[PDB]
Amino acid sequence: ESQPDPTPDELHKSSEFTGTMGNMKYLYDDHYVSATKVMSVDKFLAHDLIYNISDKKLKNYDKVKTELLNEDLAKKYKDEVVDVYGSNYYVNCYFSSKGGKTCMYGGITKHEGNHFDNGNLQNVLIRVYENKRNTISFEVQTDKKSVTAQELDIKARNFLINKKNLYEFNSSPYETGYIKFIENNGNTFWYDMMPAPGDKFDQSKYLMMYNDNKTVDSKSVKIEVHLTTKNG
Numbered sequence: 001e002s003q004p005d006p007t008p009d010e011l012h013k014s015s016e017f018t019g020t021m022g023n024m025k026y027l028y029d030d031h032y033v034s035a036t037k038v039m040s041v042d043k044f045l046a047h048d049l050i051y052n053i054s055d056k057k058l059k060n061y062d063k064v065k066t067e068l069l070n071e072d073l074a075k076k077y078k079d080e081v082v083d084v085y086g087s088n089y090y091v092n093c094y095f096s097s098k099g100g101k102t103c104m105y106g107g108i109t110k111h112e113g114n115h116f117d118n119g120n121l122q123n124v125l126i127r128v129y130e131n132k133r134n135t136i137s138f139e140v141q142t143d144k145k146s147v148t149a150q151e152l153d154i155k156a157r158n159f160l161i162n163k164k165n166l167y168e169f170n171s172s173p174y175e176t177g178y179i180k181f182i183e184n185n186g187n188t189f190w191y192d193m194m195p196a197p198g199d200k201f202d203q204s205k206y207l208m209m210y211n212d213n214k215t216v217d218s219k220s221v222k223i224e225v226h227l228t229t230k231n232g
């Protein structure tokens, strides 16, 4: 059930990536869509939901479309009152053709029953390993009991870009990186933090890993960020 951890050879290497690492940084550096109590208004493909959500900080969109793994997830949430949290993109964001528009994947949670009885916020510790040493540890926060892994991942990388220079314009000071979640039923899963090898970063394709809408229990999940400089 749980995903095996990284094999050494499969992790993406920043030395094999020849595009602009600022195109990855852009997805996580104080950049996310956020909304409360919205209900989808429209669809494009059978697995996606379009919401009326307005860009809260820069004035770039009044529509957002999320793509989900399958038509079942889309039906489940179509008429639910939901909260939205996730990373958006504009390159190759295909809508029909019928006030900017932005795209994304997953990020949706039912609002009702999903907040803490106190109105308080749940702190979630991220432990950071560099060349296998737990170097620093820091907390992100959420108001949600059952929170997307996407939302936690975005918060963690936002911090690390400022604190650790996780991504810079040209490249990264790290060669490899993966973020691992560990749930209190023992389940584990992880996301490669580095772009696929090549001379072009594909935003849409990279973000597509969040389409499963995976949620985790904020009060109990543990998170590990594992980074190497290993090459230099």
Ligand SMILES: [Zn+2]
Pocket (backbone or CB within 6 Å): 036, 037, 082, 083, 110, 111, 112, 114, 115
């Ligand atoms: Zn809510």
